[PDB]
Design an enzyme around this catalytic site. Sequence first.
Site, PDB file in Angstrom:
ATOM      1  N   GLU A   1      -7.481   4.769   7.276  1.00  0.00           N
ATOM      2  CA  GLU A   1      -7.401   6.192   6.951  1.00  0.00           C
ATOM      3  C   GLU A   1      -8.692   6.695   6.316  1.00  0.00           C
ATOM      4  OE1 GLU A   1      -3.688   5.843   4.867  1.00  0.00           O
ATOM      5  OE2 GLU A   1      -2.652   5.460   6.774  1.00  0.00           O
TER       6      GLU A   1
ATOM      7  N   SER B   1       2.931  -1.581  10.706  1.00  0.00           N
ATOM      8  CA  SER B   1       4.352  -1.571  11.061  1.00  0.00           C
ATOM      9  C   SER B   1       5.069  -2.878  10.722  1.00  0.00           C
ATOM     10  CB  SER B   1       4.574  -1.168  12.522  1.00  0.00           C
ATOM     11  OG  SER B   1       4.062   0.132  12.765  1.00  0.00           O
TER      12      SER B   1
ATOM     13  N   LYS C   1       0.079   4.179  -0.415  1.00  0.00           N
ATOM     14  CA  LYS C   1      -0.651   5.344   0.089  1.00  0.00           C
ATOM     15  C   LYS C   1      -0.451   6.517  -0.869  1.00  0.00           C
ATOM     16  CE  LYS C   1      -0.512   3.510   4.740  1.00  0.00           C
ATOM     17  NZ  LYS C   1      -0.530   3.789   6.194  1.00  0.00           N
TER      18      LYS C   1
ATOM     19  N   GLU D   1      -5.619  -4.714  10.557  1.00  0.00           N
ATOM     20  CA  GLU D   1      -4.632  -3.689  10.890  1.00  0.00           C
ATOM     21  C   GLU D   1      -5.085  -2.967  12.151  1.00  0.00           C
ATOM     22  OE1 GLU D   1      -4.308  -1.415   7.047  1.00  0.00           O
ATOM     23  OE2 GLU D   1      -2.468  -2.599   6.922  1.00  0.00           O
TER      24      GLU D   1
ATOM     25  N   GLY E   1       1.646   2.917  10.889  1.00  0.00           N
ATOM     26  CA  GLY E   1       2.566   4.032  10.783  1.00  0.00           C
ATOM     27  C   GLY E   1       3.217   4.483  12.078  1.00  0.00           C
TER      28      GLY E   1
ATOM     29  N   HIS F   1      -9.844   0.948   4.259  1.00  0.00           N
ATOM     30  CA  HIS F   1      -8.621   1.243   5.001  1.00  0.00           C
ATOM     31  C   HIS F   1      -8.907   2.215   6.143  1.00  0.00           C
ATOM     32  CE1 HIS F   1      -4.551   2.618   5.938  1.00  0.00           C
ATOM     33  NE2 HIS F   1      -4.198   1.425   5.494  1.00  0.00           N
TER      34      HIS F   1
ATOM     35  N   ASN G   1       0.870  -1.171   0.000  1.00  0.00           N
ATOM     36  CA  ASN G   1       0.000   0.000   0.000  1.00  0.00           C
ATOM     37  C   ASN G   1       0.908   1.222   0.000  1.00  0.00           C
ATOM     38  OD1 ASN G   1      -1.882   1.979   0.282  1.00  0.00           O
ATOM     39  ND2 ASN G   1      -2.532   1.390   2.357  1.00  0.00           N
TER      40      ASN G   1
END
Length: 249
Positions: free
Chosen positions: A96, A212, A12, A166, A172, A94, A10
Amino acid sequence: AKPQPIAAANWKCNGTTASIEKLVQVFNEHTISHDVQCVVAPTFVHIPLVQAKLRNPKYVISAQNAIAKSGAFTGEVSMPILKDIGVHWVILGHSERRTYYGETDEIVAQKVSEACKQGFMVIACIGETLQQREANQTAKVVLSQTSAIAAKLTKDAWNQVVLAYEPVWAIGTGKVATPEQAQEVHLLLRKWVSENIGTDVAAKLRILYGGSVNAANAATLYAKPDINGFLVGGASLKPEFRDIIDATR
């Protein structure tokens, strides 16, 4: 006994023409000798460049998001548009997008259902926040997210579904889940799928871990019996993605 693993990049909202050309060359020159589905998800505007340059036979190209139908949706890209350009994988839900861009459990479920109806492979993302975990709500949260998706799917549609667990607190942040933490959630997810969808569906379902992941922690995560690969953010922009792929051997 494990189904085919997946190693998914990904990217991003990151990349230049020059950096993508360099990294795609790295991916092309890495000869992969085992059965794994690699996936690269660039930004929409970089899809044609990746399509022109990526040649490693183990890879497919994925979108990072989509809406279900074409029409009066300024700024968005639809599933028919992706299919026409040759993209038949998509990441949906996702964290985000759930957090920044209004994607509730029901909105994610509707997108996943529409993508399955349109023949996509879907990496559907689920996961709890730090607050939900500290409140001992992890299982309730991920099962609610998964059951919302399941309610809009037929049994056969699950052959197109990949789950990506996740934990939000691991995305992150440099705070990876331990192998035991990840395995515990993957186990309860697979048990739910086994009992609510079917034992055959559960045995074939890929449940990936993300948050991570890096080349040094990947192999020990993959050794857990219910982890089928990885959704990789920051480390997928770097040449160490090659060793993450090889950690699914």
